[PDB]
Design a protein around this ligand. Sequence first.
Ligand SMILES: C=C(C)[C@@H]1CCC(C)=C[C@H]1c1c(O)cc(O)cc1CCCCC
Length: 133
Amino acid sequence: PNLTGYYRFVSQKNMEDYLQALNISLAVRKIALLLKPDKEIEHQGNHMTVRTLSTFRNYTVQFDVGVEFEEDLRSVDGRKCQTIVTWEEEHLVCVQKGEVPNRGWRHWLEGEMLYLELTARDAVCEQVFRKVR
Ligand SMILES: C=C(C)[C@@H]1CCC(C)=C[C@H]1c1c(O)cc(O)cc1CCCCC
């Protein structure tokens, strides 16, 4: 599955649980829950760039599938992670090893629908995006 596209926010669920699990303060979560970010993906070979785009903050990550890298998440929750992305069947699976247990995420594609499950500690967030065209 090639994931290149621009994907427009559709919905989210339990994003607050996930933000709490990353130790994000109350004031910052209040605002972050109002963002409705898009995802832009460039997927060429087994290199991917993944952009989370919002009116106030972008977060970008680049990686080769299967190669561990240091992911600078300081603009998100203040941490760095040793991060690895893999293909597990048709799911793109990310484990972000560090201080926070059970931290990572899953993408999968179903037609125009890009699903995203984000996990941290006991928390699970589900986001959905719609591809354009
Ligand atoms: C880049 C952003 C739009 C923000 C940046 C600030 C925080 C605390 C969370 C991110 C966030 C947010 O506030 C709401 C979301 O729906 C998704 C994400 C991106 C989460 C990063 C995943 C590794």
